[PDB]
Enzyme design. Sequence first.
Site, PDB file in Angstrom:
ATOM      1  CE1 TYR A 121      -0.139  -6.437  14.104  1.00 24.77           C
ATOM      2  CE2 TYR A 121      -2.468  -6.669  14.546  1.00 24.77           C
ATOM      3  CZ  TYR A 121      -1.443  -6.133  13.781  1.00 24.77           C
ATOM      4  OH  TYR A 121      -1.846  -5.406  12.673  1.00 24.77           O
ATOM      5  CE  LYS A 160      -7.564  -2.171   4.344  1.00 28.06           C
ATOM      6  NZ  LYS A 160      -6.412  -2.675   5.074  1.00 28.06           N
ATOM      7  CB  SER A 220      -4.364  -2.965  15.621  1.00 27.06           C
ATOM      8  OG  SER A 220      -5.223  -2.074  14.938  1.00 27.06           O
ATOM      9  NE  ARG A 263      -6.551   4.367   6.021  1.00 30.00           N
ATOM     10  CZ  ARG A 263      -5.496   5.177   5.731  1.00 30.00           C
ATOM     11  NH1 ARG A 263      -5.331   5.756   4.536  1.00 30.00           N
ATOM     12  NH2 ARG A 263      -4.597   5.458   6.678  1.00 30.00           N
ATOM     13  NE  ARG A 315      -5.355   3.854  11.284  1.00 34.21           N
ATOM     14  CZ  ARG A 315      -6.000   3.946  10.120  1.00 34.21           C
ATOM     15  NH1 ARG A 315      -7.142   4.617   9.995  1.00 34.21           N
ATOM     16  NH2 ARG A 315      -5.487   3.338   9.069  1.00 34.21           N
ATOM     17  CB  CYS A 353      -0.938  -0.110   1.177  1.00 34.24           C
ATOM     18  SG  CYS A 353      -2.332   1.072   1.258  1.00 34.24           S
ATOM     19  CE  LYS A 366      -6.426  -5.197   7.824  1.00 34.23           C
ATOM     20  NZ  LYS A 366      -5.433  -4.689   6.781  1.00 34.23           N
ATOM     21  CB  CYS A 421      -4.808   3.334   0.841  1.00 30.38           C
ATOM     22  SG  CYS A 421      -4.979   3.084   2.595  1.00 30.38           S
TER      23      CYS A 421
HETATM   24  N1  PBG Z   1      -3.473  -0.274   4.341  1.00 28.98           N
HETATM   25  C1  PBG Z   1      -3.754  -0.019   5.596  1.00 28.98           C
HETATM   26  C2  PBG Z   1      -3.744  -1.022   6.561  1.00 28.98           C
HETATM   27  N2  PBG Z   1      -3.136  -2.243   6.416  1.00 28.98           N
HETATM   28  C3  PBG Z   1      -3.342  -2.819   7.614  1.00 28.98           C
HETATM   29  C4  PBG Z   1      -4.341  -2.123   8.324  1.00 28.98           C
HETATM   30  C5  PBG Z   1      -4.823  -2.417   9.822  1.00 28.98           C
HETATM   31  C6  PBG Z   1      -4.340  -3.702  10.422  1.00 28.98           C
HETATM   32  C7  PBG Z   1      -4.690  -3.627  11.937  1.00 28.98           C
HETATM   33  O1  PBG Z   1      -5.527  -2.756  12.369  1.00 28.98           O
HETATM   34  O2  PBG Z   1      -4.096  -4.480  12.685  1.00 28.98           O
HETATM   35  C8  PBG Z   1      -4.458  -0.877   7.707  1.00 28.98           C
HETATM   36  C9  PBG Z   1      -5.071   0.276   8.146  1.00 28.98           C
HETATM   37  C10 PBG Z   1      -6.330   0.697   7.566  1.00 28.98           C
HETATM   38  O3  PBG Z   1      -6.583   0.081   6.534  1.00 28.98           O
HETATM   39  O4  PBG Z   1      -7.077   1.632   7.930  1.00 28.98           O
HETATM   40 ZN    ZN Z   2      -3.196   1.704   3.164  1.00 32.12          ZN
END
Ligand code: PBG
Ligand code: ZN
Lengths: 323, 323, 323, 323, 323
Positions: free
Chosen positions: D311, D194, D272, D215, D204, D119, D246, D129
Amino acid sequence: TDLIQRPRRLRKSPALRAMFEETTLSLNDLVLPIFVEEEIDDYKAVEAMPGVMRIPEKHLAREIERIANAGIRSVMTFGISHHTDETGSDAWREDGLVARMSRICKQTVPEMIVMSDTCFCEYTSHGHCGVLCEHGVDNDATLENLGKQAVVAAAAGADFIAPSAAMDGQVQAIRQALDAAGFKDTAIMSYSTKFASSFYGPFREAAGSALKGDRKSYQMNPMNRREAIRESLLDEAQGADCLMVKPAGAYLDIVRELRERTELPIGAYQVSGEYAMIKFAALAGAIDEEKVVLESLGSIKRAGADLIFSYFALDLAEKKILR
Amino acid sequence: TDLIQRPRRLRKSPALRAMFEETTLSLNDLVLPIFVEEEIDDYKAVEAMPGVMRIPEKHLAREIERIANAGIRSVMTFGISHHTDETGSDAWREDGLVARMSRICKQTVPEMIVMSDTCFCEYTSHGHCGVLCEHGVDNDATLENLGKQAVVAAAAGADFIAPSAAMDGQVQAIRQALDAAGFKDTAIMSYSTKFASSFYGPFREAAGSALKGDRKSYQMNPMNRREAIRESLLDEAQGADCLMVKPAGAYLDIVRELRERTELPIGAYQVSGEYAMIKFAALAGAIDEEKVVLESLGSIKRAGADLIFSYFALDLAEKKILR
Amino acid sequence: TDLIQRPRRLRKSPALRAMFEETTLSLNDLVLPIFVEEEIDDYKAVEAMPGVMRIPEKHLAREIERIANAGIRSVMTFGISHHTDETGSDAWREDGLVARMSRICKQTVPEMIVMSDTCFCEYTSHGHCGVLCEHGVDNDATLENLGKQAVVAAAAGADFIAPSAAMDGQVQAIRQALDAAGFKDTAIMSYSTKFASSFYGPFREAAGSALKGDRKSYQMNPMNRREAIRESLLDEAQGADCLMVKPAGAYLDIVRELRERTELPIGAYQVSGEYAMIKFAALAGAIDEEKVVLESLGSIKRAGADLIFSYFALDLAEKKILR
Amino acid sequence: TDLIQRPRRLRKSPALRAMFEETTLSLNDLVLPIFVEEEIDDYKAVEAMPGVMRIPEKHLAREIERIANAGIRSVMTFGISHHTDETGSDAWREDGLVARMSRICKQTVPEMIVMSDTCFCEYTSHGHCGVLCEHGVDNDATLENLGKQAVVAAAAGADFIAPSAAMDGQVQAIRQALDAAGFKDTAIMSYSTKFASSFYGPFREAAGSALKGDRKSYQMNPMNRREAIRESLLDEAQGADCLMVKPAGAYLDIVRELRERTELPIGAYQVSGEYAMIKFAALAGAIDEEKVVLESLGSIKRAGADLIFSYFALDLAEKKILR
Amino acid sequence: TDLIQRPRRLRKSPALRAMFEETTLSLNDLVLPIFVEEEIDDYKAVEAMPGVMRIPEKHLAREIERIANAGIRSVMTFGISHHTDETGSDAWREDGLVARMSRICKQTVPEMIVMSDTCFCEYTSHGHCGVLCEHGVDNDATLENLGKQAVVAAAAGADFIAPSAAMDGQVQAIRQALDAAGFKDTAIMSYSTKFASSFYGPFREAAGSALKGDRKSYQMNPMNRREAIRESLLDEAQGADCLMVKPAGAYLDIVRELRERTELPIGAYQVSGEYAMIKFAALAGAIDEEKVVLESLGSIKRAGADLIFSYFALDLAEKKILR
Ligand SMILES: NCc1[nH]cc(CCC(=O)O)c1CC(=O)O
Ligand SMILES: [Zn+2]
Ligand SMILES: NCc1[nH]cc(CCC(=O)O)c1CC(=O)O
Ligand SMILES: NCc1[nH]cc(CCC(=O)O)c1CC(=O)O
Ligand SMILES: NCc1[nH]cc(CCC(=O)O)c1CC(=O)O
Ligand SMILES: NCc1[nH]cc(CCC(=O)O)c1CC(=O)O
Ligand SMILES: [Zn+2]
Ligand SMILES: [Zn+2]
Ligand SMILES: [Zn+2]
Ligand SMILES: [Zn+2]
Ligand SMILES: [Zn+2]
Ligand SMILES: [Zn+2]
Ligand SMILES: [Zn+2]
Ligand SMILES: [Zn+2]
Ligand SMILES: [Zn+2]
Ligand SMILES: [Zn+2]
Ligand SMILES: [Zn+2]
Ligand SMILES: [Zn+2]
Ligand SMILES: [Zn+2]
Ligand SMILES: [Zn+2]
């Protein structure tokens, strides 16, 4: 041309066709229906079923050995009665014709699988498949009698009782009657989905039913696929061992649909009118008889039938066309 | 006991069992794999496949007539090479062994359906199913060669080209190559779903592959049912005429699943290790060989296979156990 | 070549193969069948099952601790009887062998899951799975006895009663008998779909059944997939806790089909003939034993089985090949 | 009570529960995401992800060996950039951070399966992104760049390119770019489905994205199950090797639905915020951390995922809780 | 790029997202669980469930009016008992706490839909969901008591009886008991699929259960999707009015699968540990609480739930976040 798919690749030779052929027909697929007349001496030709004869009772033991020796596994018995009455009571007499057909066949060829057509249209004065009422063919009075007939056929040696009367609840009535009399192991080949068909004409002649009228208040409408399936699945719920679609040849949609709705075995009856249509057109030179018969029977197998009732069966066996 | 359902009713006699038997096995179901060694004089026993021999090229025309006369419809050709090299190039030579096996079989029995195992593991120095690279077995270099082999096998008379290399895109490569060379009618029997199985040991011995190592970077993991189905359906999309599950005997779940996901024909390969397991246990008295073989083959048919590759085939045919 | 799809991408390394591997095999998947002979002193080798022995009763408590210490979760008990009779009545005696096998195993390892093979073929003079009649193996007389056996096995500590007799209505008979005797929590591991297979030879030798004849009037035809499914679903309707397909290895189509027709757990029995085929071919050098066994067992898991009965189980556990 | 069905029969002991347990969790199921910051010296704690740290580039080779030695099969690389710009161009530089993370991991542990998050949100000034426009995030300008990044990650050793940008047509763009550059064997782990989730907060902080905004014009609405499935199936059509849902933990309906609509492998990302929710509630004494984590991960497996991004993975491996 | 399909077209603006949003969340979807302690004066904070309190009985009528005035449609009652005993008999006393919670709620707000958690873990000395035995929690003794409790809760005004005990046959026992006592119209909200989850910790604290041990011999294994579905469908067969999946948040695969296997309504319980995980992570700044809660609840709706039990419900209603 740019065609990657060419179905013709597998049709090039007879050998390739045989390898890929999806549906096989053997003698293990056939049941031979037989017409037996009590109290006669000579075989009687059925004109509307060229090549079929009523077998005199006195000759049955001979005929059944012959059938057995051709490799036929099973017969369905039909009687021509010289003892008809208002209720078809000869058919539940211990030594009435129904019982004797079964007893003779089994005594002469103990390993022959005997199925006994179980009704009253051949035993009644009025010719209906049961007890006639003011209101028409009385369902529940007929059921009681079906039970009594099943008991004597089973006592006499029948492997399958085969109720062709198209009465509601007939599988369950016959099941309860066989069991209460100690015939737990006698099977039920239900004529589960049996249509009020115009293909049964020649059988009027062969089996001598006295009916002036129709069977449309009991036999189901040819056009009713949903009801056809339902009729069969009711019979599965009452405990039948084998289901059946009759007629078969104009009902292969029905066979296939049923095949995907049950795990039970399915029979299909290639009826007298289908037989007559093949025979008469062949007599006239219009078709090759043997090729049509094999195709007709194969089609019935393709559609999903485990067993097929066919009047051609003995001839195909004696000629070694099937084994 | 009050049980209306009694499955035992239909198991009482052999006759009843035969009537109701759902799955039939005939010679039309069998393909006979054959091992042919160039530049030898005597038949060579394969110790790990009791009763199997390498057939000398010089005797092939004789053996194929014999196979034909037993009633076998089809053979799959495997060569033992005396001309191996880094790329297996004898396998795309106009008159290399692959071509000659096919030419001999077809010239001697024109109606014999000839399928040519189409790979390089039997023709390569290193023993892999293709072109070896720094990176391992090079998929796309191997594909080009598969095309060239298919063309010479087809030119020599093969009815089916049968790519056993497990290369991605091999159906399409071989299809494009057959078509561009004018062999539009030559068929593809893909070894569509071919697993990296431990059941292939005895074939190492019979076919003499030089491989020290494994095929796990191309042949698929035994445990992967989803991927197995997908591998086959890709081959349908590339235009194969027939799909295949290999091995078969420990993969009947796979056969059945595939059967419900395609209308194409499906083959199933009863591999060398399955053969050896039956033979060795029977040698030891632990099983009846004939009963096991029929049951094993029947099971493969039951599971949904249209064609079965079996090393027992000629024996079953010569003994009239199947017809 | 232009191929966007390349299944080989995920097969490059052992690590990639392990990540994507769809089917896993652990000791939690295995049940160990055990042969126990009463009134002997020495372990007795079963020649047709290399590496298997009859365990003397006197040594059972020792053997079960050993099995337990290898990490095996469960055993299936089979007795070799020195007290056979016309009806197998030792098998419903409070302190007959069936009861003692279960009592010993549970007293010695209380957390061991004990399943008691529940039949009469090992206890009858004539060797059949029940009460012999003029008419053959009497279904309903056999059911009554199955109930009585189940009660004593449960009383003695068995976690599962496992009816291997292939009698109609046996789940329900055993269920009613366990419940009326206060064993509501004792489970039924039905041998729901059990075929009349030729793969059971070596078990004749191991378990010493006296049968001269066959089981084809009760055990179902190998070729009958529809009936196989139906046999299992009847058992679900009677309340079994676990279903089972037996044999397993040539019946993975059956396992998979059943898997998609029920939510109950499914066992699959890797029978004596399968065991013998692997052992004899490996003795002969034709296959690698360990690789074949893992593949065979994995395949059974892939096809949908929750539990697998395997004679290899203790060896795989003692060697830490599975955990 | 009269209950023939008692599900509790199989829940009596831990042994019975283990035998019947339908879903298993191993290290072969886990991918470890890792945060790597260029041009720092000390490990940096992520406060919102207790127990997680940014790994300095200079220490990566050490950390990857440690990860490898715990038995972890695969990592997903995330960079914290000290070189951001309007288009995220460091991410397609031959020796930019994306490339170096992959090169280091693969050089140090050649058998480690490396997946490169692909990304621009971590490399762009504005934090989106992709390529920012007057009209918002420009889909097709972003695609071109995704291709260029994929090429350098693959050149550097990445096993999987993993596009987390949620751009239309990104699988196909990356596929065409890998292939035209000669990386036919490099795989695509698409972040196929996603969602624009509120569960990504702590990321973040960990990955330092500069975004002020959202996004939602690219990532799909959490509430849209139909569109979720469709998004994934588009990616299958463009040739992805593995699909992904995801977040995962609040999306198990989605996982299961997808599982029944494709044969491809499916990943699921335990993001996360899910990690933080478990950690913070456990810190507070409200739950047992280890029991929750195993249950959360097991649930993701149960729902149908082949691979899970977690994680917790290294900790579970170093403690031998999974193997 | 040439892409005809661009899912991003419908994500451009909030208005477009709202038009196409597939799943909606309202107050008609929520049930508020409430903790009531008898014989106390002050509200008691549950530390493990920040923001939740035990409501003194004396204040209930006040609290229920407040709940009602926020627009909440329904509550689930949980008692903290000052009258525990070996069998939990206060729970079937006419004027025991279970009865009084229901009577108070219904007398004060007659249109409030009252559901009474129906178990014994909060009323027993030993803390188990029923009658403790030598053998463990006695299923059938527990059922009898569940019936008696249901009768007094219904007599007191409860709209739904909600058996959270996970006893086999509990729907049918409670149904027969309600009907024989003349409460034909009182409904059953079964906790049909209730897992032995580690997500219930904070509820130990809120409801004060005395259990030292676990519920794994009655509550089902988290990992068992097949059994989960089966558990619910049994409850449909016994006549429940509403099914339920509990916990919900890590079980959305289960919700969705069940949704496609029944037409009954389905509830889903967002349990105490899920609540605690959101609250603690938000306290720590790691997530935005309101966004997470809406997403969590929306997800439960998306997966197929008609009703959701949530501890956030009153707050969302009082703040007008949902209506
Ligand atoms: N390309 C962004 C990206 N790739 C991984 C995640 C999050 C993974 C996580 O929260 O553990 C994100 C952030 C988002 O998409 O807003
Ligand atoms: Zn991204
Ligand atoms: N119970 C009557 C019966 N059983 C067999 C058939 C016809 C079979 C044939 O036509 O070959 C008929 C006649 C009818 O139902 O109208
Ligand atoms: N291309 C190889 C090939 N083609 C046929 C088989 C085995 C057939 C058998 O075992 O009978 C093999 C060997 C292997 O793939 O490893
Ligand atoms: N009730 C018989 C029984 N129970 C177990 C098996 C065979 C198990 C094996 O072959 O390993 C058999 C024998 C048979 O049914 O013919
Ligand atoms: N009958 C017990 C009961 N009823 C409600 C829940 C938990 C609800 C929650 O955690 O919010 C529990 C506890 C448990 O079953 O272990
Ligand atoms: Zn007379
Ligand atoms: Zn009639
Ligand atoms: Zn009817
Ligand atoms: Zn030479
Ligand atoms: Zn090869
Ligand atoms: Zn392929
Ligand atoms: Zn003795
Ligand atoms: Zn037996
Ligand atoms: Zn049965
Ligand atoms: Zn710098
Ligand atoms: Zn997309
Ligand atoms: Zn008090
Ligand atoms: Zn409780
Ligand atoms: Zn239940």
